Amino acid sequence: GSHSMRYFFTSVSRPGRGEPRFIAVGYVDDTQFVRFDSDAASQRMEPRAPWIEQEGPEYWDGETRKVKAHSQTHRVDLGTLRGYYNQSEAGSHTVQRMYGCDVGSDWRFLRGYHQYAYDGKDYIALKEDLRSWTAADMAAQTTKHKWEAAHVAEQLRAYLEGTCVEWLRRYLENGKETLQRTDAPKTHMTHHAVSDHEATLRCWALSFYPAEITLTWQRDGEDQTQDTELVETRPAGDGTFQKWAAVVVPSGQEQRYTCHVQHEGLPKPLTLRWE
Amino acid sequence: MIQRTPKIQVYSRHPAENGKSNFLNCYVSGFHPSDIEVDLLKNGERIEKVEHSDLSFSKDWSFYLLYYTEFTPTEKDEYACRVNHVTLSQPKIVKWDRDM
Amino acid sequence: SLFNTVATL
């Protein structure tokens, strides 16, 4: 199916406590594969998936050199933004950057992204055409001007449409065991009396990959959206995900309810019932 | 500036089975700024060897982290996660329930 | 593989 590669960068200023904290992480789909932490001893880009451990020193030295440059950029950016927004030197502020590329089921380039946020809100983003910029406010219009004159979008377009997707395809092949896999949800249901006249039915999806899943309850075939407790999909720690959906049912009505599970790893959508 | 409160879920990696080794997880997500304190507790006391994932974020810019430690559940040991963040006036404590 | 980044805000 479809795939993506994404890098995420966070820098947080630490006035009086040294240089800003910088953390970079890279993903292919829902699988992390590299990290850099400014506060760690190694000062190197590091593997976080087994398939990337096979890349040689030339890859790791190159990623380390580039990630330090991303770090430097954010150090400059924090000072710039502080200036643009007339903020004091005392406060901690956050710059975030994300970029990457999507390929479709044919593995061909589908979409590219490159976006920046300051203190949790949009600052500037490359439009989907990869040729123009969305400036969130008046300060960002200044960055937009600078970047338009320096033809920054042209350089990003060439990466997002080219090397981004070439590397994504390389990773897909080298990590085929990890990345071209699906883990279908293992499902179960639990029943727990919450009083003499009500019971909780909890429908579970465990050990699935990728994270995308749809879990719903029906009563007599009618969707129970506004009556269903749904937790956010959550990582298990081992590369798989979990989720559950619960309904409180009047004792005696258990048979009216069905849980429906949709996931790429299933041969067909599941319908589960308590007896 | 923007401040978003962490969602908190405390749970095990594997379905809990007493006397069988496992990982206790505390997943925090949807929060901003990224400074956050997360402790895993056993019978109300801080567990020393807790690791976490590398800071990352969602399309809406909000952060998420997974804190985790090895543990072997028993019938009687009680676990919890204790979270502090700028959006919380006091640490928020969520108890582990093996069916949640 | 990372972009060869050059621009600052």
Short mmCIF file of C-alpha atoms in Angstrom, two decimals:
data_model
loop_
_atom_site.label_atom_id
_atom_site.label_comp_id
_atom_site.label_asym_id
_atom_site.label_seq_id
_atom_site.Cartn_x
_atom_site.Cartn_y
_atom_site.Cartn_z
CA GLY A 1 0.00 0.00 0.00
CA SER A 2 0.82 3.69 0.51
CA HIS A 3 3.86 4.83 2.59
CA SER A 4 5.43 7.91 4.10
CA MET A 5 8.73 9.13 5.51
CA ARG A 6 8.65 11.98 8.00
CA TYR A 7 11.21 13.85 10.10
CA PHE A 8 10.16 15.81 13.21
CA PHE A 9 12.34 18.43 14.95
CA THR A 10 11.73 20.16 18.25
CA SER A 11 13.88 22.86 19.84
CA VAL A 12 13.14 24.38 23.22
CA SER A 13 14.99 27.42 24.58
CA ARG A 14 16.45 27.16 28.05
CA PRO A 15 17.33 30.73 29.09
CA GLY A 16 20.07 30.64 31.75
CA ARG A 17 20.35 26.84 31.41
CA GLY A 18 22.59 26.56 28.34
CA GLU A 19 21.84 25.94 24.67
CA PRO A 20 18.32 24.97 23.52
CA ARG A 21 17.25 21.32 23.82
CA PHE A 22 17.00 19.81 20.29
CA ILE A 23 15.41 16.46 19.47
CA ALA A 24 15.07 15.01 15.99
CA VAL A 25 13.18 11.84 15.11
CA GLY A 26 12.60 10.08 11.75
CA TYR A 27 9.76 7.69 10.85
CA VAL A 28 8.81 5.48 7.98
CA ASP A 29 5.04 5.01 8.31
CA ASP A 30 4.38 4.33 12.07
CA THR A 31 7.89 3.02 12.72
CA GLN A 32 10.59 5.25 14.23
CA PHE A 33 14.02 4.56 12.74
CA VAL A 34 16.43 7.37 13.81
CA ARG A 35 16.86 9.93 16.63
CA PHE A 36 19.21 12.73 17.69
CA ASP A 37 19.17 14.22 21.17
CA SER A 38 21.22 17.35 21.89
CA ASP A 39 21.56 16.38 25.55
CA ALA A 40 22.82 12.84 24.90
CA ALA A 41 26.51 11.94 25.16
CA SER A 42 27.07 10.55 21.63
CA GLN A 43 26.17 13.68 19.64
CA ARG A 44 25.32 11.40 16.71
CA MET A 45 22.28 10.38 14.78
CA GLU A 46 21.33 6.99 16.15
CA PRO A 47 19.41 3.96 14.86
CA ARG A 48 16.03 3.13 16.43
CA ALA A 49 14.96 0.35 14.04
CA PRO A 50 16.95 -2.82 13.27
CA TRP A 51 16.87 -2.45 9.47
CA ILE A 52 18.72 0.90 9.56
CA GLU A 53 21.60 -0.51 11.65
CA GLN A 54 22.86 -1.99 8.34
CA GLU A 55 23.65 1.42 6.84
CA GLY A 56 27.40 2.09 6.95
CA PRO A 57 29.52 4.79 8.60
CA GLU A 58 29.11 7.00 5.55
CA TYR A 59 25.33 7.13 6.14
CA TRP A 60 25.65 7.74 9.91
CA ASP A 61 28.37 10.35 9.59
CA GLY A 62 26.29 12.11 6.90
CA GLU A 63 23.05 12.01 8.94
CA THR A 64 24.97 13.23 12.00
CA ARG A 65 26.44 16.15 9.99
CA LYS A 66 22.99 17.07 8.57
CA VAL A 67 21.16 16.73 11.91
CA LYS A 68 23.67 19.07 13.61
CA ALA A 69 22.88 21.56 10.85
CA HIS A 70 19.13 21.21 11.60
CA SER A 71 19.99 21.84 15.27
CA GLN A 72 22.00 24.98 14.41
CA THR A 73 19.16 26.26 12.26
CA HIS A 74 16.73 26.01 15.17
CA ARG A 75 19.18 27.78 17.51
CA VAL A 76 19.20 30.70 15.07
CA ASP A 77 15.43 30.44 14.57
CA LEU A 78 14.67 30.71 18.31
CA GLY A 79 16.59 34.02 18.48
CA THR A 80 14.91 35.27 15.28
CA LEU A 81 11.38 34.52 16.43
CA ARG A 82 12.01 36.03 19.87
CA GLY A 83 12.97 39.20 17.96
CA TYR A 84 9.96 39.08 15.58
CA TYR A 85 7.48 38.70 18.41
CA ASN A 86 9.18 41.24 20.77
CA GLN A 87 9.49 38.64 23.49
CA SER A 88 11.78 38.81 26.49
CA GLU A 89 14.98 36.81 27.04
CA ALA A 90 13.58 35.10 30.17
CA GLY A 91 10.96 32.74 28.70
CA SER A 92 11.28 29.28 27.17
CA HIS A 93 9.90 28.98 23.69
CA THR A 94 9.44 26.10 21.23
CA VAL A 95 10.23 25.83 17.51
CA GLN A 96 8.91 22.71 15.67
CA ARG A 97 9.63 21.62 12.09
CA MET A 98 8.28 18.66 10.14
CA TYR A 99 8.92 17.56 6.59
CA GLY A 100 8.55 14.43 4.47
CA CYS A 101 6.98 12.69 1.54
CA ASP A 102 4.11 10.33 0.72
CA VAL A 103 4.10 7.67 -1.98
CA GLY A 104 0.98 5.89 -3.17
CA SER A 105 0.33 2.19 -3.62
CA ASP A 106 2.44 2.39 -6.85
CA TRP A 107 5.38 3.72 -4.71
CA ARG A 108 5.46 6.90 -6.80
CA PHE A 109 5.58 10.38 -5.30
CA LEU A 110 2.12 11.48 -4.05
CA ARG A 111 2.64 14.47 -1.75
CA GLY A 112 5.36 16.47 0.04
CA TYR A 113 5.28 18.54 3.24
CA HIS A 114 7.44 21.11 4.98
CA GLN A 115 6.01 22.99 7.95
CA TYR A 116 7.15 25.15 10.90
CA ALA A 117 5.37 26.06 14.20
CA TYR A 118 6.36 28.53 16.95
CA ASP A 119 4.98 28.02 20.45
CA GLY A 120 2.52 25.40 19.25
CA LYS A 121 0.96 27.25 16.35
CA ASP A 122 1.53 27.35 12.56
CA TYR A 123 4.25 29.73 11.52
CA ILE A 124 5.03 28.92 7.87
CA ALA A 125 4.22 25.94 5.58
CA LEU A 126 5.07 24.88 2.04
CA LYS A 127 1.83 24.59 0.01
CA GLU A 128 0.94 21.27 -1.63
CA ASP A 129 2.22 22.57 -4.99
CA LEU A 130 5.73 22.71 -3.39
CA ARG A 131 6.21 26.14 -5.03
CA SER A 132 4.55 28.58 -2.62
CA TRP A 133 4.22 29.36 1.10
CA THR A 134 1.43 29.80 3.67
CA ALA A 135 2.37 32.47 6.24
CA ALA A 136 0.26 32.14 9.39
CA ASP A 137 0.62 35.79 10.41
CA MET A 138 2.43 39.12 9.89
CA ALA A 139 5.82 37.88 11.22
CA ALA A 140 5.72 34.80 8.97
CA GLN A 141 5.16 37.05 5.89
CA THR A 142 8.72 38.34 6.55
CA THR A 143 10.08 34.79 6.49
CA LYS A 144 8.00 34.12 3.36
CA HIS A 145 9.66 37.11 1.60
CA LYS A 146 13.13 35.92 2.60
CA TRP A 147 12.46 32.38 1.43
CA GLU A 148 10.85 33.39 -1.87
CA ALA A 149 13.91 35.52 -2.76
CA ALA A 150 16.30 32.69 -1.77
CA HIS A 151 14.26 30.13 -3.80
CA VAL A 152 14.04 27.85 -0.74
CA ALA A 153 10.92 26.10 -2.09
CA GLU A 154 12.78 25.01 -5.24
CA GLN A 155 15.40 23.19 -3.15
CA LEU A 156 12.70 21.59 -0.96
CA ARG A 157 10.65 20.55 -3.99
CA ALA A 158 13.69 18.73 -5.48
CA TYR A 159 14.26 16.86 -2.22
CA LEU A 160 10.61 16.03 -1.54
CA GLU A 161 9.92 14.76 -5.10
CA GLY A 162 13.30 13.06 -5.48
CA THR A 163 15.71 12.04 -2.78
CA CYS A 164 12.90 11.82 -0.14
CA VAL A 165 11.02 9.20 -2.14
CA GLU A 166 14.17 7.39 -3.32
CA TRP A 167 15.29 6.97 0.30
CA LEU A 168 11.75 5.94 1.35
CA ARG A 169 11.77 3.21 -1.29
CA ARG A 170 15.26 2.11 -0.17
CA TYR A 171 14.09 1.85 3.46
CA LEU A 172 10.94 -0.06 2.43
CA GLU A 173 13.08 -2.66 0.67
CA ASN A 174 15.80 -2.88 3.36
CA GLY A 175 13.20 -3.06 6.15
CA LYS A 176 10.65 -5.20 4.26
CA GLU A 177 10.21 -7.53 7.30
CA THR A 178 9.37 -4.48 9.51
CA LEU A 179 7.68 -2.04 7.08
CA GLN A 180 5.86 -3.95 4.32
CA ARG A 181 4.17 -6.03 7.05
CA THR A 182 0.74 -5.80 8.64
CA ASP A 183 -0.04 -7.17 12.11
CA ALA A 184 -3.82 -7.80 12.24
CA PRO A 185 -5.46 -6.88 15.50
CA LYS A 186 -5.90 -9.64 18.05
CA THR A 187 -9.37 -8.94 19.40
CA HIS A 188 -11.35 -9.83 22.51
CA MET A 189 -14.27 -8.62 24.58
CA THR A 190 -14.72 -8.27 28.30
CA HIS A 191 -17.93 -7.94 30.28
CA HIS A 192 -17.96 -6.32 33.70
CA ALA A 193 -21.04 -5.52 35.78
CA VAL A 194 -20.97 -1.88 36.88
CA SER A 195 -24.23 -2.27 38.88
CA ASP A 196 -27.14 -4.73 39.28
CA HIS A 197 -28.73 -3.41 36.06
CA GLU A 198 -25.83 -2.32 33.77
CA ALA A 199 -22.70 -3.92 32.35
CA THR A 200 -19.69 -2.63 30.43
CA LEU A 201 -18.81 -4.30 27.15
CA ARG A 202 -15.21 -3.47 26.13
CA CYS A 203 -14.06 -4.38 22.63
CA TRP A 204 -10.28 -4.71 22.37
CA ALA A 205 -7.84 -4.50 19.45
CA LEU A 206 -4.24 -5.47 20.35
CA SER A 207 -0.84 -6.02 18.73
CA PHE A 208 -1.76 -4.36 15.40
CA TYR A 209 0.28 -2.45 12.82
CA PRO A 210 -0.01 0.05 11.25
CA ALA A 211 -1.74 2.28 13.82
CA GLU A 212 -4.76 3.14 11.62
CA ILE A 213 -7.86 1.22 12.82
CA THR A 214 -11.62 1.72 13.05
CA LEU A 215 -13.39 0.32 16.12
CA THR A 216 -17.13 0.96 16.55
CA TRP A 217 -20.16 -0.36 18.44
CA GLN A 218 -23.58 -0.90 16.89
CA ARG A 219 -26.93 -1.46 18.63
CA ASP A 220 -29.37 -3.35 16.40
CA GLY A 221 -27.06 -2.31 13.55
CA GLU A 222 -27.25 1.40 14.42
CA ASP A 223 -24.01 3.28 15.13
CA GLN A 224 -23.49 4.18 18.80
CA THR A 225 -20.97 7.02 18.28
CA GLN A 226 -22.24 9.31 21.04
CA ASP A 227 -22.58 6.43 23.47
CA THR A 228 -19.21 4.77 22.95
CA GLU A 229 -16.13 5.37 25.09
CA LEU A 230 -13.16 5.29 22.66
CA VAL A 231 -9.54 5.60 23.80
CA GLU A 232 -6.87 7.11 21.59
CA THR A 233 -4.80 4.49 19.72
CA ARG A 234 -1.73 3.86 21.89
CA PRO A 235 1.71 2.30 21.32
CA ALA A 236 2.40 -1.06 23.00
CA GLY A 237 6.16 -0.40 23.21
CA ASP A 238 7.05 -3.24 20.84
CA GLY A 239 6.15 -1.52 17.55
CA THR A 240 2.49 -2.53 17.68
CA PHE A 241 -0.60 -0.54 18.72
CA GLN A 242 -3.67 -1.04 20.94
CA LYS A 243 -7.15 0.47 21.19
CA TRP A 244 -10.46 -0.25 22.85
CA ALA A 245 -14.08 0.89 22.57
CA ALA A 246 -16.68 0.40 25.36
CA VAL A 247 -20.43 0.68 25.75
CA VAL A 248 -22.45 0.49 28.93
CA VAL A 249 -25.34 -1.82 28.20
CA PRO A 250 -28.52 -2.42 30.21
CA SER A 251 -28.17 -5.90 31.76
CA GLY A 252 -30.06 -8.26 29.46
CA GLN A 253 -29.41 -6.38 26.19
CA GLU A 254 -25.89 -7.71 25.45
CA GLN A 255 -27.04 -9.50 22.26
CA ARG A 256 -28.21 -6.25 20.61
CA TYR A 257 -24.65 -4.94 20.44
CA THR A 258 -21.96 -5.62 17.90
CA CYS A 259 -18.36 -4.44 17.78
CA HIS A 260 -16.94 -3.76 14.31
CA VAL A 261 -13.19 -3.82 13.62
CA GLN A 262 -11.64 -2.52 10.40
CA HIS A 263 -7.90 -2.87 9.90
CA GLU A 264 -5.63 -3.37 6.88
CA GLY A 265 -4.29 -6.61 8.38
CA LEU A 266 -7.76 -8.22 8.49
CA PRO A 267 -8.92 -10.39 5.55
CA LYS A 268 -12.43 -8.85 6.01
CA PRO A 269 -13.87 -6.48 8.65
CA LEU A 270 -14.69 -8.25 11.94
CA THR A 271 -18.05 -8.33 13.73
CA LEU A 272 -17.87 -9.36 17.37
CA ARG A 273 -20.74 -9.99 19.75
CA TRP A 274 -21.06 -11.01 23.35
CA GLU A 275 -22.99 -14.29 22.76
CA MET B 1 0.87 31.17 24.76
CA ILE B 2 -0.70 27.84 23.84
CA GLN B 3 -0.93 25.26 26.60
CA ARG B 4 -2.60 21.89 26.01
CA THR B 5 -3.16 19.35 28.76
CA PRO B 6 -1.74 15.80 28.39
CA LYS B 7 -4.10 12.94 27.77
CA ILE B 8 -2.87 10.09 30.03
CA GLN B 9 -3.26 6.33 29.59
CA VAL B 10 -1.62 3.76 31.89
CA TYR B 11 -1.57 0.16 30.68
CA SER B 12 0.48 -2.95 30.09
CA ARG B 13 2.21 -4.01 26.83
CA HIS B 14 0.76 -7.52 27.07
CA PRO B 15 -2.55 -8.63 28.63
CA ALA B 16 -1.68 -8.80 32.35
CA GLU B 17 -1.10 -12.30 33.78
CA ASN B 18 0.02 -12.54 37.39
CA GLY B 19 3.65 -13.67 37.79
CA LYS B 20 4.34 -13.16 34.05
CA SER B 21 6.87 -10.54 32.90
CA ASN B 22 5.51 -7.53 31.04
CA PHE B 23 5.95 -3.78 30.55
CA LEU B 24 4.02 -1.10 32.34
CA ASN B 25 3.29 1.86 30.07
CA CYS B 26 2.25 5.44 30.64
CA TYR B 27 1.36 7.15 27.36
CA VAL B 28 1.04 10.98 27.47
CA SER B 29 -0.15 12.79 24.39
CA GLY B 30 -1.82 15.95 23.05
CA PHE B 31 0.23 18.24 25.31
CA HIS B 32 2.09 21.54 24.77
CA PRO B 33 4.68 22.79 25.75
CA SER B 34 6.88 19.65 25.84
CA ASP B 35 8.24 19.96 29.43
CA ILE B 36 6.48 17.16 31.30
CA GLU B 37 7.18 15.04 34.38
CA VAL B 38 5.99 11.41 34.32
CA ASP B 39 6.51 8.82 37.07
CA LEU B 40 5.41 5.22 37.25
CA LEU B 41 4.35 4.15 40.77
CA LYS B 42 4.27 0.81 42.57
CA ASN B 43 2.14 0.89 45.72
CA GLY B 44 2.42 4.67 45.68
CA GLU B 45 6.21 4.87 45.37
CA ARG B 46 8.31 6.04 42.40
CA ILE B 47 9.75 3.26 40.27
CA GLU B 48 13.44 4.04 39.62
CA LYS B 49 14.21 2.48 36.25
CA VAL B 50 11.77 4.09 33.83
CA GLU B 51 12.60 4.83 30.21
CA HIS B 52 10.82 6.91 27.63
CA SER B 53 10.47 7.29 23.89
CA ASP B 54 12.07 10.11 21.95
CA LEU B 55 9.97 13.26 21.93
CA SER B 56 7.79 13.46 18.86
CA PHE B 57 4.57 15.22 17.82
CA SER B 58 1.30 14.97 15.90
CA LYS B 59 0.03 16.87 12.84
CA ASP B 60 -1.56 19.42 15.23
CA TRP B 61 1.94 20.01 16.80
CA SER B 62 1.02 18.45 20.14
CA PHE B 63 3.63 16.18 21.74
CA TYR B 64 3.51 12.52 22.76
CA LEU B 65 5.75 10.30 24.83
CA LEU B 66 5.66 6.77 26.08
CA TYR B 67 7.17 6.01 29.49
CA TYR B 68 7.77 2.39 30.30
CA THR B 69 9.39 -0.08 32.63
CA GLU B 70 9.62 -3.85 33.07
CA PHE B 71 7.19 -5.23 35.65
CA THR B 72 5.66 -8.56 36.66
CA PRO B 73 2.07 -7.99 37.76
CA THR B 74 0.71 -9.69 40.91
CA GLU B 75 -2.83 -9.93 42.32
CA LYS B 76 -2.16 -7.26 44.94
CA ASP B 77 0.51 -4.85 43.65
CA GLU B 78 -1.06 -1.57 42.59
CA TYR B 79 0.41 0.53 39.80
CA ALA B 80 -0.22 4.12 38.71
CA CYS B 81 1.20 6.94 36.58
CA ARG B 82 1.75 10.40 38.05
CA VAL B 83 1.97 13.28 35.60
CA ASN B 84 2.83 16.93 36.04
CA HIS B 85 2.64 19.65 33.43
CA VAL B 86 2.11 23.44 33.38
CA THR B 87 -1.60 22.86 32.64
CA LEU B 88 -2.07 20.86 35.87
CA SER B 89 -2.36 22.66 39.22
CA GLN B 90 -1.31 19.45 40.96
CA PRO B 91 0.15 16.13 39.77
CA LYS B 92 -2.50 14.00 38.07
CA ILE B 93 -2.58 10.34 39.13
CA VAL B 94 -4.15 7.67 36.96
CA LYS B 95 -4.38 4.16 38.37
CA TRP B 96 -3.54 1.06 36.34
CA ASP B 97 -6.54 -1.16 35.65
CA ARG B 98 -5.61 -4.36 33.78
CA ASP B 99 -8.77 -4.12 31.62
CA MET B 100 -8.19 -0.53 30.43
CA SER C 1 17.86 10.51 4.67
CA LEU C 2 17.69 14.15 5.84
CA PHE C 3 17.32 17.21 3.63
CA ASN C 4 20.50 19.30 3.24
CA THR C 5 18.93 22.25 5.13
CA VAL C 6 20.24 25.78 4.54
CA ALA C 7 17.63 28.46 5.30
CA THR C 8 16.76 29.92 8.66
CA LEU C 9 13.45 31.73 9.38
#
